[PDB]
Enzyme design. Sequence first.
Site, PDB file in Angstrom:
ATOM      1  N   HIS A  60       0.840  -1.229   0.000  1.00 29.06           N
ATOM      2  CA  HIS A  60       0.000   0.000   0.000  1.00 29.06           C
ATOM      3  C   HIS A  60       0.867   1.267   0.000  1.00 29.06           C
ATOM      4  CE1 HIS A  60       0.262  -0.427   4.500  1.00 29.06           C
ATOM      5  NE2 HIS A  60       0.443   0.885   4.380  1.00 29.06           N
TER       6      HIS A  60
ATOM      7  N   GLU B  95       0.733  -8.424   0.788  1.00 28.96           N
ATOM      8  CA  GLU B  95       0.993  -7.047   1.296  1.00 28.96           C
ATOM      9  C   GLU B  95       2.497  -6.773   1.440  1.00 28.96           C
ATOM     10  OE1 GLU B  95      -1.270  -4.967   0.979  1.00 28.96           O
ATOM     11  OE2 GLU B  95      -0.295  -3.159   1.921  1.00 28.96           O
TER      12      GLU B  95
ATOM     13  N   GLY C  24       1.823   5.541  11.110  1.00 25.50           N
ATOM     14  CA  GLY C  24       3.247   5.903  11.253  1.00 25.50           C
ATOM     15  C   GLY C  24       4.144   4.677  11.413  1.00 25.50           C
TER      16      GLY C  24
ATOM     17  N   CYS D 127       3.777   1.614   9.880  1.00 25.86           N
ATOM     18  CA  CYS D 127       3.731   0.678   8.729  1.00 25.86           C
ATOM     19  C   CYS D 127       5.135   0.546   8.160  1.00 25.86           C
ATOM     20  CB  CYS D 127       2.706   1.056   7.674  1.00 25.86           C
ATOM     21  SG  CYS D 127       1.049   0.636   8.261  1.00 25.86           S
TER      22      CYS D 127
END
Length: 182
Positions: A41, A72, A146, A148
Site C-alpha cells: 500500500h 501485502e 506511522g 507501517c
Amino acid sequence: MGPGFDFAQAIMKKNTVIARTEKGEFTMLGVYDRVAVIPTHASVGEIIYINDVETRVLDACALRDLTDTNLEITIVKLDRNQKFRDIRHFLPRCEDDYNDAVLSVHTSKFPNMYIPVGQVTNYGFLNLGGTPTHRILMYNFPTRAGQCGGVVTTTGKVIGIHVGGNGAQGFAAMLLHSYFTD
C-alpha cells in the site's frame, strides 16, 4: 533493555532506510544487495526517496501467494551505490507463531522507536483495508498510523513487517526465506 531489543537495534542500525512515496514515509527493511521490502500500500513507483535522496527503482514486485491472494509485501530493487548487510539467514523458512517479539520503527515522526509487542499469533487470513490478505501475524498492541513497514523481530529472527491495525491489535505480513532466493 534486554536481548530482544539488542537484536532489534542491530537490525535497525544497519538494515533500515527511510522510504518516502506519494503515500507517505515508511520504515524500509534492506535484506541483501540492493533488495528491500515495504508494504504494498506504499504504492512504489519508478522513483522513490531513500533517506531524502531521489532513487530510481530498478524493479518492484507486489507478492501474492499461489491462491492469487495479496501478501501485502513489495520487493524493491534500488539503484543505490551501496549494498545492505545480507540478513537472509535470520529469515524463518516456515509460517509459525512466536513468543516475545519487538516492533521497531525509524521515521521522521518516530525515530529510534522499539515496542515490546509480546506473543505473535499465526493469524492467517485478514480483510486488510477491504483487501483479502494471507500470511498475517497478529500481536495485541494498539499500533498507530506511522508504524507501517516497522520490523518485527525475535532474538535471532526477522519475522515480518507491520502492515495494519484495528486499534487493539497490530498486523504484520510474514517474511519467509523463500521470498529472497537469488
